[PDB]
Chain A
Amino acid sequence: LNNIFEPHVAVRDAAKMNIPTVGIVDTNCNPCLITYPVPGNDDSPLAVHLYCRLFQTAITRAKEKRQQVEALYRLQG
């Protein structure tokens, strides 16, 4: 929900072009078009810092972990 209390249009256009969306639904949203919903608060100052950091740690184990498999295929050529 933005600053007008209305479901955003990006979640409606994502399912149109066959694009998944992982959103954080609270208690006043529409968790129908979200392919991976999860009930959780998203209005507290100290709470939003947790989800924003967990998404940062997921990058450090996805793109940074890519180098572990690049050396396996580079042994042949």
Chain B
Amino acid sequence: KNRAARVRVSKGDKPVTYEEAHAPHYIAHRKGWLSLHTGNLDGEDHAAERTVEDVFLRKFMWGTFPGCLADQLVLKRRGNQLEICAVVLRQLSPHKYYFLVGYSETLLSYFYKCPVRLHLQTVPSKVVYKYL
């Protein structure tokens, strides 16, 4: 059994979302891509550095928000304008959210030589699609 990143169908009790709920072969059909940059085309290079930066940013966003995030994060590498557009939960005070957003933007702009602006989305919790 080719057990991939798809959700196993067993008992109806796992609040699975919509992102990783689909099969890994429906990416170019019923899904999409979290990251997007010019390194994924013919004739371009420096893709290893882009992948390292992407995985480091993902780890940093997952560590700085222990549960404040819902699913994942969409990457938009517009040459020299990174945008970590994601969502936010309605559980903490807005002051803490503003503080964390400002700290992350300052760290990004002063470390990766790139300004970052966020676009938070008001959701109650995890975007659940099936209770299976």
- Determine whether A and B are in direct contact in the complex, meaning some CB atoms lie less than 8 angstroms apart: no
On A, residues with C-beta under 8 Å from B are: none
